[PDB]
Amino acid sequence: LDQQTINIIKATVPVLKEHGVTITTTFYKNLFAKHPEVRPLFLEQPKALAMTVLAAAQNIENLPAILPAVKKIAVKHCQAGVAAAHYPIVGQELLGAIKEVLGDAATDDILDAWGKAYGVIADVFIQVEADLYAQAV
Amino acid sequence: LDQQTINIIKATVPVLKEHGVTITTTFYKNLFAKHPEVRPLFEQPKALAMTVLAAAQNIENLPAILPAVKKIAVKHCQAGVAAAHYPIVGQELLGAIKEVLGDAATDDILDAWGKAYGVIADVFIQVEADLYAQAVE
Ligand code: HEM
Ligand code: HEM
């Protein structure tokens, strides 16, 4: 991530957190409708993905600070059969959710910044899980 | 880390690696001579500088070396390594890189390495802080 990029995430994350419920519900609704293939891996409905990414983004400059949580989420992901190739589809639906919510405020840069941020955050998950999948055998 | 910093790091690590033995021995030499107080914490230690260079080659995807970072963090926490020790190691590491760069040790290049050591040290410092916390519950 560049500095400017970090800067956009820092300025905008609090507006995303304010509309958290909408982002979360829109994300999951779009995820399951558009990518029916991942439904099987998941009142008990999942709700923490989007806010967890925002929490990561709030600390975009110190991602190691969320390792203790990432480590635990990873155990659950490896247990469910989450693959590296799933990450782009989740990112796509998260970004679409962010876009709908930002509405008019949805500038390109803003979107592109979020696209990058998600990338870096997803990378941490992907590595930690790759490493646990390898540790399993 | 701006891109120019990253470019300097990627271009120069190979020179530093070729000069490994020198950087390593000058680093430990000056570390213990200038900072006798850390001596007790440590058939001699040898891995530090080469490990930072390795982290630097990976500076763009630090998560990839977490499994090493993690295991090193345990040793550091077992040894009583503190966040305030990082700047002193950084100072002696840069002294060594400066010596080996000789004529190529431009200001710009040293500043880049300074920056890079900073980012890498920040990762270890956070991991170890989480491990120190984890020891008390
Ligand atoms: C950076 C991106 C992601 C984040 C931040 C994330 C976050 C989370 C969180 C917080 C949990 C619940 C852990 C708990 O409290 O038990 C979870 C579980 C789960 N995630 Fe993710 N997720 C990410 C990407 C994905 C991907 C790409 C998929 C692939 C479909 C996925 C599938 C699941 C599944 C199947 C569960 C388990 C539900 C359960 O039984 O708890 N996640 N995720
Ligand atoms: C980013 C900076 C650092 C890196 C990459 C690093 C790397 C390492 C490595 C690779 C080991 C050996 C682990 C093994 O094979 O068991 C080690 C051990 C240790 N490091 Fe560091 N270290 C760093 C900073 C520091 C600092 C700031 C201090 C404090 C003076 C320090 C003190 C030690 C000590 C006392 C040990 C244990 C001696 C031993 O290995 O038996 N390190 N470190």
Side-chain angles (χ1 to χ4, degrees):
Chain A
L1 267 17
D2 56 52
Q3 186 70 27
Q4 149 89 308
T5 286
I6 286 186
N7 294 161
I8 301 159
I9 292 314
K10 284 182 141 339
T12 59
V13 65
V15 188
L16 298 184
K17 277 221 189 132
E18 185 105 85
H19 285 311
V21 63
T22 313
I23 287 170
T24 291
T25 53
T26 295
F27 164 80
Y28 280 100
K29 178 184 168 147
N30 291 350
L31 180 56
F32 298 132
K34 300 171 188 185
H35 305 280
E37 69 273 21
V38 314
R39 295 171 192 186
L41 296 179
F42 288 88
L43 290 151
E44 309 212 296
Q45 289 301 308
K47 307 277 168 196
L49 174 290
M51 295 310 296
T52 293
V53 168
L54 290 193
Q58 187 59 270
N59 330 107
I60 201 47
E61 285 182 328
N62 185 0
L63 294 167
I66 72 185
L67 296 171
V70 168
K71 280 40 158 140
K72 243 44 42 192
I73 293 172
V75 170
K76 282 156 175 198
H77 274 181
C78 292
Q79 173 178 243
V82 173
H86 286 131
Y87 290 83
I89 286 160
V90 155
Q92 299 179 21
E93 290 320 317
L94 183 62
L95 255 312
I98 290 173
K99 161 169 213 135
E100 254 164 79
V101 153
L102 280 183
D104 264 323
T107 82
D108 321 314
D109 280 312
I110 286 182
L111 293 202
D112 305 5
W114 277 99
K116 293 170 191 190
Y118 170 72
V120 159
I121 294 167
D123 295 326
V124 181
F125 275 85
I126 291 170
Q127 299 278 183
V128 169
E129 284 162 13
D131 302 313
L132 270 40
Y133 272 136
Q135 294 177 25
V137 72
Chain B
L1 256 25
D2 66 353
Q3 193 55 46
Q4 180 64 0
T5 296
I6 305 190
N7 291 156
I8 285 163
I9 300 290
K10 311 219 92 212
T12 63
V13 212
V15 193
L16 304 188
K17 292 189 178 230
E18 264 189 34
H19 272 214
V21 72
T22 301
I23 287 164
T24 293
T25 53
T26 292
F27 165 77
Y28 283 100
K29 192 177 182 195
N30 299 342
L31 180 59
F32 298 137
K34 298 187 210 222
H35 306 278
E37 77 265 23
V38 312
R39 295 171 192 188
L41 300 176
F42 300 82
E43 211 176 287
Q44 299 305 297
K46 304 287 167 168
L48 176 290
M50 296 307 322
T51 301
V52 170
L53 288 193
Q57 313 192 261
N58 289 87
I59 192 81
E60 296 194 274
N61 190 202
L62 291 178
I65 60 153
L66 265 167
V69 171
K70 167 81 179 198
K71 203 57 94 138
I72 297 157
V74 170
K75 283 199 191 56
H76 282 174
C77 289
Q78 177 182 220
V81 170
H85 291 128
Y86 286 87
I88 82 164
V89 148
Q91 179 209 336
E92 297 318 325
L93 186 49
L94 256 297
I97 287 182
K98 170 169 196 146
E99 285 177 34
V100 304
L101 289 164
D103 287 319
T106 66
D107 269 320
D108 284 309
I109 284 166
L110 289 168
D111 296 2
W113 278 92
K115 284 156 195 179
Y117 170 73
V119 177
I120 288 152
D122 283 341
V123 172
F124 278 84
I125 284 166
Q126 178 69 245
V127 172
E128 285 161 3
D130 287 321
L131 279 190
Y132 272 138
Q134 183 179 23
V136 281
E137 146 110 21

